[PDB]
Amino acid sequence: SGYGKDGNIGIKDEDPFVDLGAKDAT
Amino acid sequence: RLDELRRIVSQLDIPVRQVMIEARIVEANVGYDKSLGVRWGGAYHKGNW
Protein backbone atom coordinates (compact mmCIF):
# COMPACT_ATOMS: atom_id res chain seq x y z
CA SER A 1 0.00 0.00 0.00
CA GLY A 2 0.95 3.56 -0.75
CA TYR A 3 0.79 6.14 1.97
CA GLY A 4 0.86 9.75 0.79
CA LYS A 5 -2.34 8.87 -1.05
CA ASP A 6 -2.53 5.32 0.35
CA GLY A 7 -3.49 2.53 -2.03
CA ASN A 8 -3.40 -1.27 -1.80
CA ILE A 9 -5.43 -2.87 -4.52
CA GLY A 10 -5.61 -6.28 -2.81
CA ILE A 11 -7.81 -5.00 0.03
CA LYS A 12 -10.36 -3.69 -2.47
CA ASP A 13 -9.76 -6.80 -4.54
CA GLU A 14 -11.63 -8.27 -1.60
CA ASP A 15 -14.32 -5.70 -2.41
CA PRO A 16 -12.77 -1.60 -11.67
CA PHE A 17 -14.73 1.08 -13.56
CA VAL A 18 -16.72 2.06 -10.45
CA ASP A 19 -14.44 1.19 -7.50
CA LEU A 20 -11.27 2.62 -9.04
CA GLY A 21 -13.06 5.74 -10.34
CA ALA A 22 -14.03 6.77 -6.81
CA LYS A 23 -10.87 5.39 -5.22
CA ASP A 24 -8.80 7.37 -7.73
CA ALA A 25 -10.96 10.49 -7.50
CA THR A 26 -8.18 12.13 -5.48
CA ARG B 1 -11.52 97.78 43.26
CA LEU B 2 -15.06 98.06 41.93
CA ASP B 3 -13.88 99.43 38.59
CA GLU B 4 -11.15 96.83 38.22
CA LEU B 5 -13.62 94.07 38.91
CA ARG B 6 -16.03 95.61 36.40
CA ARG B 7 -13.41 95.58 33.65
CA ILE B 8 -12.63 91.96 34.32
CA VAL B 9 -16.40 91.34 34.45
CA SER B 10 -16.62 92.74 30.94
CA GLN B 11 -13.99 90.25 29.82
CA LEU B 12 -15.86 87.40 31.54
CA ASP B 13 -19.25 88.26 30.03
CA ILE B 14 -18.40 86.21 26.94
CA PRO B 15 -20.69 83.73 25.16
CA VAL B 16 -19.78 80.06 25.45
CA ARG B 17 -18.09 79.10 22.18
CA GLN B 18 -19.76 76.39 20.09
CA VAL B 19 -17.95 74.58 17.26
CA MET B 20 -19.53 72.31 14.63
CA ILE B 21 -17.29 69.28 14.16
CA GLU B 22 -17.70 67.30 10.95
CA ALA B 23 -15.54 64.19 10.83
CA ARG B 24 -16.27 61.93 7.90
CA ILE B 25 -15.52 58.25 7.49
CA VAL B 26 -14.76 56.95 4.00
CA GLU B 27 -14.47 53.19 3.53
CA ALA B 28 -13.72 51.56 0.19
CA ASN B 29 -13.39 47.78 -0.21
CA VAL B 30 -12.52 46.19 -3.55
CA GLY B 31 -12.52 42.42 -3.76
CA TYR B 32 -11.43 39.86 -6.37
CA ASP B 33 -11.53 36.11 -5.71
CA LYS B 34 -10.90 33.42 -8.32
CA SER B 35 -10.88 29.66 -7.78
CA LEU B 36 -10.31 27.13 -10.56
CA GLY B 37 -11.07 23.40 -10.29
CA VAL B 38 -9.71 21.49 -13.31
CA ARG B 39 -11.22 18.05 -13.71
CA TRP B 40 -10.49 15.06 -15.99
CA GLY B 41 -12.59 12.00 -15.25
CA GLY B 42 -12.83 8.84 -17.33
CA ALA B 43 -13.77 5.55 -15.67
CA TYR B 44 -13.36 3.36 -18.76
CA HIS B 45 -9.58 3.31 -18.38
CA LYS B 46 -9.84 4.24 -14.70
CA GLY B 47 -8.17 7.57 -15.29
CA ASN B 48 -9.55 10.40 -13.18
CA TRP B 49 -7.87 13.47 -11.70
Contact B43 A21 (CB under 8 A): yes
What's the Cα-to-Cα distance from B1 to each of B4, B7, B8, B9, B13, rounded to whole Å?
Answer: 5, 10, 11, 12, 18
Instruction: Judge whether B15 is closer than 8 Å to chain A, CB to CB.
Output: no
Q: Identify whether the C-beta of residue A24 lies closer than 8 Å to the C-beta of residue B46.
A: yes
Contact B43 A25 (CB under 8 A): no
> Which structural technique was applied?
cryo-EM
Find all residues with CB under 8 Å of A2, minimum gap 6, and list them: A8
How far apart are the C-alpha atoms of A18 and B49, rounded to whole Å? 14
Q: Categorise residue B46: left if φ over 0, alpha if ψ from -120 to 50, beta otherwise.
A: left
The structure was resolved to a resolution in Å of 6.9
Instruction: Judge whether B43 is closer than 8 Å to chain A, CB to CB.
Output: yes
